[PDB]
Amino acid sequence: RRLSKEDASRVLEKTKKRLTHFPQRKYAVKA
Amino acid sequence: PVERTGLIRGLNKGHKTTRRVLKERPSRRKGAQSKRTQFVRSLIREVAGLAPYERRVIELLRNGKDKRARKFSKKKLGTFGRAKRKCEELQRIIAESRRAH
Amino acid sequence: NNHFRKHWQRRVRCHFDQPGKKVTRRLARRAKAAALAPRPVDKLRPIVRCPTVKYNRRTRLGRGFTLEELKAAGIPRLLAPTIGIAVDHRRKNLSEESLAANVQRLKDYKARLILFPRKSNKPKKADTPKDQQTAETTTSLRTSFGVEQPLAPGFTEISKSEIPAGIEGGAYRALRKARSDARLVGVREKRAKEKAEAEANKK
Amino acid sequence: QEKKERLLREATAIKEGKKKEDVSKKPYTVKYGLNHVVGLIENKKASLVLIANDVDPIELVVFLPALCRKMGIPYAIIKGKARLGTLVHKKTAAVVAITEVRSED
Amino acid sequence: AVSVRKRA
Amino acid sequence: GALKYLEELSKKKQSDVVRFLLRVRCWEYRQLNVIHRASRPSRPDKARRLGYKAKQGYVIYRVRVRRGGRKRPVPKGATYGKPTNQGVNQLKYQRSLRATAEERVGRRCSNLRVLNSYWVNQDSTYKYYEVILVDPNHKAIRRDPRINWICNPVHKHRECRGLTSTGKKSRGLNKGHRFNKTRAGRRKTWKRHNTLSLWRYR
RNA sequence: AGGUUGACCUCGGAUCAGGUAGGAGGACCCGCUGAACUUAAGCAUAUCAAUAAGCGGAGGAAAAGAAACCAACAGGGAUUGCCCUAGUAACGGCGAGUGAAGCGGCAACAGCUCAAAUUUGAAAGCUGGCUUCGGCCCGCGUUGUAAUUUGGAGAGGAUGCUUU
RNA sequence: AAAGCUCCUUCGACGAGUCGAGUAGUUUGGGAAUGCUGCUCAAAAUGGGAGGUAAAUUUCUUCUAAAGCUAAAUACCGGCCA
Numbered sequence: 001r002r003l004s005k006e007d008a009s010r011v012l013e014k015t016k017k018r019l020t021h022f023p024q025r026k027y028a029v030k031a
Numbered sequence: 032p033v034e035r036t037g038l039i040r041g042l043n044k045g046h047k048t049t050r051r052v053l054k055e056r057p058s059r060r061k062g063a064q065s066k067r068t069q070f071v072r073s074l075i076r077e078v079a080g081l082a083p084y085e086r087r088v089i090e091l092l093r094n095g096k097d098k099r100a101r102k103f104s105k106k107k108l109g110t111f112g113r114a115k116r117k118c119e120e121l122q123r124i125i126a127e128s129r130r131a132h
Numbered sequence: 133n134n135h136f137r138k139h140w141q142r143r144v145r146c147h148f149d150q151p152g153k154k155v156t157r158r159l160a161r162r163a164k165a166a167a168l169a170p171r172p173v174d175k176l177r178p179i180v181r182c183p184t185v186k187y188n189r190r191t192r193l194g195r196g197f198t199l200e201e202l203k204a205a206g207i208p209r210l211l212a213p214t215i216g217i218a219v220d221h222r223r224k225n226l227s228e229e230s231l232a233a234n235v236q237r238l239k240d241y242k243a244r245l246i247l248f249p250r251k252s253n254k255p256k257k258a259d260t261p262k263d264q265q266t267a268e269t270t271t272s273l274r275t276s277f278g279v280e281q282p283l284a285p286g287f288t289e290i291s292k293s294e295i296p297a298g299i300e301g302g303a304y305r306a307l308r309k310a311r312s313d314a315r316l317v318g319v320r321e322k323r324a325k326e327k328a329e330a331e332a333n334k335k
Numbered sequence: 336q337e338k339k340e341r342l343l344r345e346a347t348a349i350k351e352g353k354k355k356e357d358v359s360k361k362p363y364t365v366k367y368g369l370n371h372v373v374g375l376i377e378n379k380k381a382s383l384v385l386i387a388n389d390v391d392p393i394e395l396v397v398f399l400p401a402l403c404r405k406m407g408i409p410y411a412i413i414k415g416k417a418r419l420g421t422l423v424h425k426k427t428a429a430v431v432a433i434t435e436v437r438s439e440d
Numbered sequence: 441a442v443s444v445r446k447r448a
Numbered sequence: 449g450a451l452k453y454l455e456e457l458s459k460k461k462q463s464d465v466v467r468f469l470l471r472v473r474c475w476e477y478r479q480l481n482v483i484h485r486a487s488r489p490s491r492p493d494k495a496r497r498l499g500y501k502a503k504q505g506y507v508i509y510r511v512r513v514r515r516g517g518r519k520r521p522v523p524k525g526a527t528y529g530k531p532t533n534q535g536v537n538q539l540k541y542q543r544s545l546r547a548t549a550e551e552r553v554g555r556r557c558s559n560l561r562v563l564n565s566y567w568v569n570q571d572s573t574y575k576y577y578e579v580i581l582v583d584p585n586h587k588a589i590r591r592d593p594r595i596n597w598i599c600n601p602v603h604k605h606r607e608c609r610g611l612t613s614t615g616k617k618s619r620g621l622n623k624g625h626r627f628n629k630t631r632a633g634r635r636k637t638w639k640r641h642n643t644l645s646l647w648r649y650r
Numbered sequence: 651a652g653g654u655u656g657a658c659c660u661c662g663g664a665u666c667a668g669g670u671a672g673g674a675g676g677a678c679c680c681g682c683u684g685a686a687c688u689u690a691a692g693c694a695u696a697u698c699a700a701u702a703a704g705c706g707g708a709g710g711a712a713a714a715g716a717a718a719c720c721a722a723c724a725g726g727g728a729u730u731g732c733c734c735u736a737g738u739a740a741c742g743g744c745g746a747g748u749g750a751a752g753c754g755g756c757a758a759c760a761g762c763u764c765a766a767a768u769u770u771g772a773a774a775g776c777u778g779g780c781u782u783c784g785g786c787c788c789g790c791g792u793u794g795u796a797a798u799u800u801g802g803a804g805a806g807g808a809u810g811c812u813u814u
Numbered sequence: 815a816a817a818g819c820u821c822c823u824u825c826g827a828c829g830a831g832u833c834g835a836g837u838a839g840u841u842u843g844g845g846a847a848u849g850c851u852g853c854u855c856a857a858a859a860u861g862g863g864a865g866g867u868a869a870a871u872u873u874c875u876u877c878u879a880a881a882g883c884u885a886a887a888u889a890c891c892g893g894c895c896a
Contacts, residue, residue, distance in 0.1 A: 001670090003599055007590045012763080013797070015593075021813055021817045022210040026248040028170040029216070029241070031270040035724085039185075041310025042317060046188070046724040048227035056224075057801040057826085061718095061878055062860030065827060067377075067452070067767090070442050072859090075456040078401050079463035084856085106855080109835025111870080113857060120858090133737055137689075137747080139701070143643045150648060157757070157887085175759085183725045184753055192754090195727055199802065208819060209802080213760085221802035222717080222727045222877095229724080250814095258812080338772070355771090362772060368792040370449030374768045377442040391659080392490055395793055397465065398453045416793090417658035426658065429793060434770095444767040445799095446806035446825055450793085452766065452827075459830055462856090487660070492793060497765040497829050498881055504777050504790060517839080517852050520683090529685075531694055538839050540851040543682070551706085558671040564881070567831060585670055588777050588790090594763065597883055601709075608707040609680045613881070619681075620849055622879085623719045623728090625866075628751065629842065630849065632714060632730075633680075636889090638700075641750080645732085678890035700841070711889080718833105718863050718878045731888050740843045740866105749843045751866105758887035765881070766827060801878090805826070813817060 089121050165271060172273045175218040176241050178234040179279060190282050193274070196220030197234055204231070205238035215245060216273065241277065366432040367423040369395060376406055381432040383409050387416035390429045399430065454493035474569045477576050483511045483556050486578060490568055498564040498580060501595075505586035509557065511549040512574040517541070546614045549577040550607035557581055561598045562607040565614070 011019070032050035036043050081089070084107045091100035097118075104114035165173050178201065180194035196218035202209055212219050217238070225231040246265055249255040255262070270276040299306050345355040366372060366381070375381040376399075384403055390396045403410040413419070419428035460466055473490065486508040489495035500506055518541040519525070525536055541548075546565055554562050560581040569576035583589055584599040597603070606612050610619050620630030629637060 001601070003590060003596065007596060010591060010593050010596075012593050014799095015762090017814095017817060018210070022214055023250070025214045025250070026171070027215050028246040028248075028265075028267075028269045029172055029273065029276070030244040030246060031268045031276060036310075038307070038310055040307060041314045044310070044314075048229055048724050051225060051228055051231070053224060053226075057803045058878060060801075060826075060860080061828070062858090062862070063826090064859060064861090066825085067442055067444055067827060068859085070377075071452050071456055071827095074398060074401055074405060075453060075460065078398050079457060079460040079465060082460070082462040082856095084462075105835090108857060109855075110857090113834075116858070116861095135737080135748085137698070138642060139698090140642075140644055142701095143639065145643050145645050147645075147647045153757095160758095160887090180726065181724055182754075183721065183723045185723060187753065188723050188725070190754090195759095206819095210818070218759090219802090220727065223725095227724065256813080341772080359771075362770090364770085364772075366768090366770070368768085368770085368794065370451070370794070371768050371770065371792075373450045373453075374444070375770090377444075378768085379441045380768095389659085390793070392492065392793075393469070394454055394457055395450055395492065398450075398457065402453075415658080420792095421657070423792075425792065427793080443825080444805095444827065447768085448806070449767075455766075455829080459832095459857090461831060488793065493765085494829085496794095499764070502791060502794060503775095515852080533694085534839065538852085540839050541682085542840080542850060544851070559669085560671095570831080583670085586777075588795095591776085594882090597763095602712080603708090605707050608682095609713090610682090610707095611680080611713090615681080617880085618850065621714075622849095623715095623717055624864075625720085625751065625844090626848060626864085628844085628848075634700080634849090635681090636679085636713075639889095640731090647733095675892075677892045695845100713888105715884085717876105718880100719876090721865085722875075729884105730886090740847105741845075742843105751843100758885105760886095761884075763881105763883065765829065799827105801826100801828075803826095806822105806824080808822075809820080812819080814815105 085117075085121060088118065089125060092118065092122055092125055169271070170269060172216060172271045174273045175213075175216050176237075176273050176277055177218055178220075178237065179230070180223070181230065189284070191279055192282065193279060194220065194223065196223070197238060198223050198225055198231075200225055201231060201234045201238060204235045205242065207238060207242065215247065217241070237277070363435060363437055365422055366434055367419075367425075367428050367430070369429045372430045372432045373399075373402070375432055375434060376402055376408055379406055379408070380434045381408050382435070383411075383433045385411055385413045385419065385431045387419055387427075387429055388412050388414050389416055396429055451493040451496065454491075455497075458491065458493065470569055474571055474576070477510060477512060477569060478571070478574070480510070483509060483553060486510045489578060489580075491566060491578065494566045495578070495580060498566055500563075500580045503588055503592075505583040505589040507557070507560065507581045507583070509553045509579045509581060510568070510576065511553050511579060512576045513545045513549045513552070514573060515545055515570065515575045543610075543618050544614045545575050546577055547607065547610075547612070547618065549575075550579055550612060550614070553579040553581070554605060554607050559583070559585070561603055562605075562612060563598070564612060 032052075033043050034050075035045040035047050037047045038044050084103075088100050088104055088107075091097075091103060100118055100121075101114055104117050105111055108114050108117060161173070176197075177193040177195070178197045179191050181188055181191050197205075197212070197220065199209060199219075199221055202212055202217075202219065207215075207217065209219060225234075246260045246267065246269070247258065248265065249259040301309075341359060344358050348355055348358040366375060372381065372384065376384065384399070386396050386399050400410055400412075416427040416429060419431050420426050422428065422431060457463075457466065461470070489500060489508050490510075492500075495508065500508070517537065518539045519536045520527075520539060522528075522536070546567070550562050550565050553565075554560070561584055563580040563582050565577050565579040567575070568578050582595060582598050590596050590599055603611070607615065610616065620627050620634070623631060631637075
């Protein structure tokens with residue numbers, strides 16, 4: 001009865017635009 | 032904003048800082064009339080008419096029993112402030128009816 | 133004053149799992165650090181002042197930086213949570229000092245930030261170049277960007293010629309007068325209004 | 336089918352480097368959908384409004400003659416939401432409007 | 441006319 | 449659209465047109481079954497703002513519930529203990545009649561999930577409600593990220609556990625000082641306050 | 651042919667095509683319902699206790715949750731939990747007793763989605779069936795399926811760089 | 815094609831038998847200031863709620879209800895492994 005992987009991974013298009021242009025970046029902070 | 036005195040007590044008490052003016056937050060716009068909402072409410076008022084207690088208050092205001100209208104409005108609505116606003120609105124309705132007639 | 137009149141024995145919580153829970157928390161923190169490396173384990177937090185008259189002497193870390201702080205620091209609000217900056221849209225800057233301090237904090241973080249490109253073969257102009265990408269890093273923003281001065285200095289030396297004269301009449305009398313005026317603000321206003329009405333009537 | 340043919344022609348024009356407006360003309364249709372028609376009435380774009388007599392719930396159209404009278408729009412109540420649906424290729428239609436037609440009509 | 445919003 | 453006009457009209461429940469519609473619909477719903485399926489929402493603006501869509505997988509069920517208080521099922525309507533200074537005629541059920549309507553509709557359609565519900569009518573005997581339900585096994589529901597949260601098993605029978613809107617109201621899940629005892633859960637908060645905590649180095 | 655031929659709406663049938671629910675478990679969790687022994691000299695307020703028993707509904711956690719909050723400060727800033735607040739403010743026959751919260755330190759941190767707007771120069775959306783896997787059909791749906799917006803804003807403008 | 819930043823004349827929809835009131839029962843430390851439910855009444859547009867002593871008048875401060883989702887830190891006399 002669990003939702004399929006594709007259906008569970010479906011996102012809204014506004015979310016997709018936000019993730020396309022502002023994903024979680026890789027960064028470091030100088031000591 | 033009034034500058035604080037730098038004292039722990041008294042009028043305008045408190046630590047002195049440089050107060051800023053803020054652009055008003057959009058959540059604080061609630062209550063403001065918009066043109067479409069005003070238009071739709073006027074049309075719906077014209078279509079639906081009045082409630083029976085509103086007709087009673089309008090009759091009292093026409094007969095000039097203002098205190099009786101306020102007391103009856105408070106009994107019907109529940110609070111003094113809501114009664115006062117409702118009586119002002121119905122007096123406006125009476126005034127526009129008279130200026131139409 | 134012993135509150136043992138209910139069935140208290142059904143709701144006794146002992147803490148034998150205290151060292152085990154410390155071990156579990158440390159394992160979770162090490163796993164989180166390994167997943168987040170080379171990013172720091174925490175987000176940058178602003179400096180805010182505690183409310184109420186008991187605690188307004190002391191500063192501490194807040195939830196997140198304000199939108200006006202981010203705007204004055206030049207960090208867009210969609211970019212900020214992706215580079216380890218906490219954002220709080222509820223907090224406002226009522227005064228200039230806290231705003232300036234948090235803007236300087238954001239600028240220091242942005243100056244110490246190393247931003248790796250999304251694609252290694254195609255770096256962008258907002259990205260840190262590879263020959264600056266190698267430097268000593270910190271993994272604890274709560275330590276490297278903590279509250280340096282939670283309280284004001286309690287001791288300060290000045291010259292004897294720079295001793296303030298003091299408020300006229302004395303500090304105790306100034307406090308008494310401020311309290312008295314606060315208690316009599318409305319009585320004096322009513323008396324002035326009555327005097328103005330009498331003067332208008334018998335001018 | 337007509338839309339598919341039009342989109343094929345526009346895809347051909349895009350492929351040969353032309354705008355879709357070069358091969359497609361401005362359309363003139365009966366306007367439908369209750370929210371759309373109420374918007375057209377409020378913007379005073381509708382020239383003629385036809386309202387079905389049997390909309391259930393009636394509250395969806397009960398304000399429509401008053402709205403049309405306030406905006407100075409000619410309206411008529413007509414029999415058949417199914418009859419209006421035959422105009423707009425649907426089973427039912429609560430309201431239809433005409434804004435503009437062609438020069439020959 | 442009554443408009444919900446400015447349109448492009 | 450027309451839904452702004454519908455909302456403003458639905459505010460005017462004592463006007464002539466709305467009272468006429470309410471009267472005739474109350475008669476019709478009284479002639480129909482106690483729980484029956486509605487072909488469409490009779491209050492489309494209310495249903496839409498509560499989350500109904502005109503999409504396959506959304507259904508509306510209309511239900512009437514007997515109104516008034518609650519009676520304790522004791523023999524001859526009397527108890528055999530200490531005096532209570534009150535009768536069962538004044539006992540008040542701690543949930544809403546809306547919640548009772550939602551639960552009975554959920555039992556009638558056990559394959560669906562109750563999303564929300566809304567008042568449509570009342571008379572002296574009954575209060576009438578329309579309940580929005582979502583089919584978690586329908587493909588159109590499962591493919592939609594705005595609604596397929598309800599396909600997860602944690603939302604089985606929300607109306608039974610008080611996770612609908614009337615359930616949250618009855619559980620008193622609000623912030624602030626007026627809701628000190630209930631905002632995190634009344635029984636859980638009671639257990640937290642009545643737990644004796646003993647540390648090792650005490 | 652019009653006493654006909656149809657469009658809809660509502661309501662039914664079918665071992666119709668495809669699905670789904672029930673029972674178990676119930677330590678922990680969300681609700682409902684709900685005592686008495688006890689403690690008050692006895693005892694109808696009270697206490698035991700918003701507890702036991704009874705009933706319904708979940709999961710690996712549940713629940714709560716991104717303020718119609720706290721405050722009154724130089725202001726804090728979703729939720730949860732620990733320490734502290736504090737046996738305090740407060741409630742209480744004839745008194746036995748009862749009893750929070752804000753701040754503060756810490757564990758852990760994460761933010762968002764709709765309704766209300768005309769895509770109107772084009773329902774741009776979707777279940778199902780058949781497939782040569784290209785698509786094609788039966789439909790749903792304008793009594794509104796996509797995109798766009800959610801108050802932190804946003805819509806329209808202006809403007810020149812950035813982004814995938 | 816979509817996306818962000820900066821500035822602006824203007825525009826800026828925002829959830830109703832609900833909020834609120836009375837009353838009744840129950841509940842709370844909130845037996846002047848608590849929550850829930852039933853019955854009766856029943857809103858508004860800078861409006862509404864809150865600001866723990868009732869009310870009128872004048873201010874001020876804070877959020878923005880009546881639609882919705884969401885990991886972690888928390889519980890665990892059931893089950894499985896140690």
